[PDB]
């Protein structure tokens, strides 16, 4: 599935 | 007139947790909208009830794109927008790993003694927040042991009550890390 | 040869206004998924009949992804336009790729997540899935950010397994599509070069999937040794070689495809 | 801000032949950004009615895209992609070839 929800870069 | 805002429950949100913004006047308006001024601003449009007036705004999941400060507005019917409520800065917490809450000289103190808390993390971060007894702002020195580490000496406020800190970054005051280990400061 | 590729693009306008997002994922040579945030309703549309059979909750917990790293790349649009002291006017772009290559066994080969700002490398998670490179001191910022959150933890956590685990799920639902094959249609062109120059063209075209060995053979040896999407799942290979006019019948294309038991023998027929 | 010049590609599903519907391909690949003006014509004038694809890009981050359409290949009709970019001077028409 999709990557995790991450952090703004 | 201006209109009311406020939070519940609070000013800090978590992130995936939703917020009620609640702007509430007694000139009776029809109408309401809410503003978000930030990185990215915007506008809601809501109909006002009649308990005083008022509007409940629910923002959320929030996220780091609805952070910023708030003010609300009431209007009649077409809209005759009334003057800002006072601002109010919605932050986002639960980003980044926790900083530690350590005091000095502990937790618990003797009846007319100070406390000064010590938010520490590896992670490098530029400010450091405390609460509540959510107003305490200072900033964080760059290495000991490769930590960083600011000093709330709290002198003459030291009453006792629950406190967490957060790391920030400059570049994003809105965005907190998460909650440190609440530590609760009790004046024995 | 098995892959699970996430690519996504962030356009920041000049002004106010959401950069659009959008985000297509493969498996191996099939897009199956896409996202985009400029619809009337954006959620995470399907893109193949074969995830269609995924649950309710599997779409709804894959659009939420989707939408948390909308906001996620408009805020770093945001930042980045703030890195550099870049005022409103000019329109930007950000990049990342995001996907793992299983290895010969059922477990990870190589996981990706790179970050390129406005067409030039910006971040990258290192190759052990703990490290980072950063292009300037800009993504330095972004690494220190980033480290704050263990964004590494959690993506080797799903490079290892999830992304692995899930490629072998969308493997087994569809083999029908994926693991089967099709053969190439097959034509040969001729077009003059020069005076004593001539310029051949072994066309495969509509065929799954893109691994196909295509070689020009002049009596006995390899004289030689790109494909592009036909719009219907298949694709389309030609291999040049350039031979002296009038020596045309000598040079040969053998062609070599999964959907092919023997290999093609291919010369100019020109009828 | 790098510009990339796009690489524009006009064939179709099919060789081609009279009596068989085919679709035209209008393929662009290695272009950045990804801001292009893609529309494809029969005879001088533009197609209002076609669809593409989703956009991606490659391992250089240039992006690609393809737009198609349904059409009748004739000897007395001829078909091409005009396309513009910022890398582009000018919007520049690239004619069909049936090869």
Same mark, same amino acid.
């Given at each position: 599935?999709?990557?995790?929800? &991450?952090?703004?870069? | 007139?201006?209109?009311?805002?406020?939070?519940?429950?609070?000013?800090?949100?978590?992130?995936?947790?939703?917020?009620?913004?609640?702007?509430?006047?007694?000139?009776?308006?029809?109408?309401?909208?809410?503003?978000?001024?930030?990185? =990215?601003?915007?506008?809601?449009?809501?109909?006002?009830?009649?308990?005083?007036?008022?509007?409940?705004?629910?923002?959320?999941?929030?996220?780091?794109?609805?952070?910023? &400060?708030?003010?609300?507005?009431?209007?009649?019917?077409? *809209?005759?927008?009334?003057?800002?409520?006072?601002?109010?800065?919605?932050?986002?917490?639960?980003?980044?790993?926790?900083?530690?809450?350590?005091?000095?000289?502990?937790?618990?103190?003797?009846?007319?003694?100070?406390?000064?808390?010590?938010?520490?993390?590896?992670?490098?971060?530029?400010?450091?927040?405390?609460?509540?007894?959510?107003?305490?702002?200072?900033?964080?020195?760059?290495?000991?042991?490769?930590?960083?580490?600011?000093? =709330?000496?709290?002198?003459?406020? $030291?009453?006792?009550?629950?406190?967490?800190?957060?790391?920030?970054?400059?570049?994003?005051?809105?965005?907190?890390?998460?909650?440190?280990?609440?530590?609760?400061?009790?004046?024995? | 040869?098995?892959?699970?590729?996430?690519?996504? $693009?962030?356009?920041?306008?000049?002004?106010?206004?959401?950069?659009?997002?959008?985000?297509?994922?493969?498996?191996?040579?099939?897009?199956?998924?896409?996202?985009?945030?400029?619809?009337?309703?954006?959620?995470?549309?399907?893109?193949?009949?074969?995830?269609?059979?995924?649950?309710?909750?599997?779409?709804?917990?894959?659009?939420?992804?989707?939408?948390?790293?909308?906001?996620?790349?408009?805020?770093?649009?945001?930042?980045?336009?703030?890195?550099?002291?870049?005022?409103?006017?000019?329109?930007?772009?950000?990049?990342?790729?995001?996907?793992?290559?299983?290895?010969?066994?059922?477990?990870?080969?190589?996981?990706?997540?790179?970050?390129? *700002?406005?067409?030039?490398?910006?971040?990258?998670?290192?190759?052990?899935?703990?490290?980072?490179?950063?292009?300037? $001191?800009?993504?330095?910022?972004?690494?220190?950010?980033?480290?704050?959150?263990?964004?590494?933890?959690?993506?080797?956590? *799903?490079?290892?397994?999830?992304?692995?685990?899930?490629?072998?799920?969308?493997?087994? %639902?569809?083999?029908?599509?994926?693991?089967?094959?099709?053969?190439?249609?097959?034509?040969?062109?001729?077009?003059?070069?020069?005076?004593?120059?001539?310029?051949?063209?072994?066309?495969?075209?509509?065929?799954?999937?893109?691994?196909?060995?295509?070689?020009?053979?002049?009596?006995?040896?390899?004289?030689?040794?790109? &494909?592009?999407?036909?719009?219907?799942?298949?694709?389309?290979?030609?291999?040049?070689?350039?031979?002296?006019?009038?020596?045309?019948?000598?040079?040969?294309?053998?062609?070599?495809?999964?959907?092919?038991?023997?290999?093609?023998?291919?010369?100019?027929?020109?009828? | 801000?790098?510009?990339? &010049?796009?690489?524009?590609?006009?064939?179709?599903?099919?060789?081609?032949? %009279?009596?068989?519907? !085919?679709?035209?391909?209008?393929?662009?690949?290695?272009?950045?950004?990804?801001?292009?003006?893609?529309?494809?014509?029969? !005879?001088?004038?533009?197609?209002?009615?076609?669809?593409?694809?989703?956009?991606? =890009?490659?391992?250089?981050?240039?992006?690609?895209?393809?737009?198609? $359409?349904?059409?009748?290949?004739?000897?007395?009709?001829?078909?091409?992609?005009?396309? %513009?970019?910022?890398?582009?001077?000018?919007?520049?028409?690239?004619?069909?070839?049936?090869?």
């Amino acid at each position: 599935r999709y990557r995790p929800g &991450t952090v703004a870069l | 007139r201006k209109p009311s805002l406020l939070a519940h429950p609070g000013r800090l949100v978590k992130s995936e947790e939703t917020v009620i913004l609640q702007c509430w006047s007694d000139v009776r308006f029809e109408h309401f909208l809410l503003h978000r001024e930030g990185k =990215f601003k915007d506008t809601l449009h809501l109909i006002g009830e009649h308990h005083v007036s008022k509007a409940n705004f629910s923002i959320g999941p929030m996220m780091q794109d609805l952070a910023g &400060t708030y003010r609300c507005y009431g209007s009649v019917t077409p *809209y005759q927008l009334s003057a800002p409520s006072d601002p109010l800065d919605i932050v986002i917490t639960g980003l980044y790993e926790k900083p530690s809450l350590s005091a000095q000289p502990g937790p618990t103190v003797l009846a007319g003694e100070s406390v000064t808390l010590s938010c520490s993390s590896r992670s490098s971060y530029d400010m450091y927040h405390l609460s509540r007894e959510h107003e305490c702002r200072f900033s964080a020195g760059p290495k000991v042991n490769g930590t960083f580490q600011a000093d =709330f000496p709290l002198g003459p406020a $030291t009453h006792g009550g629950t406190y967490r800190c957060f790391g920030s970054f400059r570049d994003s005051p809105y965005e907190w890390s998460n909650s440190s280990d609440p530590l609760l400061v009790s004046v024995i | 040869s098995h892959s699970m590729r996430y690519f996504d $693009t962030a356009v920041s306008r000049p002004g106010r206004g959401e950069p659009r997002f959008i985000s297509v994922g493969y498996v191996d040579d099939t897009q199956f998924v896409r996202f985009d945030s400029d619809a009337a309703s954006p959620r995470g549309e399907p893109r193949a009949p074969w995830v269609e059979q995924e649950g309710p909750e599997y779409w709804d917990r894959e659009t939420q992804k989707y939408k948390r790293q909308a906001q996620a790349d408009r805020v770093s649009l945001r930042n980045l336009r703030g890195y550099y002291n870049q005022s409103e006017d000019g329109s930007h772009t950000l990049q990342r790729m995001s996907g793992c290559d299983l290895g010969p066994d059922g477990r990870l080969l190589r996981g990706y997540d790179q970050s390129a *700002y406005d067409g030039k490398d910006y971040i990258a998670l290192n190759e052990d899935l703990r490290s980072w490179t950063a292009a300037d $001191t800009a993504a330095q910022i972004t690494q220190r950010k980033l480290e704050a959150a263990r964004a590494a933890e959690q993506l080797r956590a *799903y490079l290892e397994g999830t992304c692995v685990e899930w490629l072998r799920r969308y493997l087994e %639902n569809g083999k029908e599509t994926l693991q089967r094959a099709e053969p190439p249609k097959t034509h040969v062109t001729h077009h003059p070069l020069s005076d004593h120059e001539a310029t051949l063209r072994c066309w495969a075209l509509g065929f799954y999937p893109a691994e196909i060995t295509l070689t020009w053979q002049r009596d006995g040896e390899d004289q030689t040794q790109e &494909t592009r999407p036909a719009g219907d799942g298949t694709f389309q290979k030609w291999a040049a070689v350039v031979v002296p006019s009038g020596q045309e019948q000598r040079y040969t294309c053998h062609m070599q495809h999964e959907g092919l038991q023997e290999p093609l023998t291919l010369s100019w027929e020109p009828s | 801000m790098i510009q990339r &010049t796009p690489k524009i590609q006009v064939y179709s599903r099919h060789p081609a032949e %009279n009596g068989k519907s !085919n679709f035209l391909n209008c393929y662009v690949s290695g272009f950045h950004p990804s801001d292009i003006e893609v529309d494809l014509l029969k !005879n001088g004038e533009r197609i209002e009615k076609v669809e593409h694809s989703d956009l991606s =890009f490659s391992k250089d981050w240039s992006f690609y895209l393809l737009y198609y $359409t349904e059409f009748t290949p004739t000897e007395k009709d001829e078909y091409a992609c005009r396309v %513009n970019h910022v890398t582009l001077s000018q919007p520049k028409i690239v004619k069909w070839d049936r090869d």
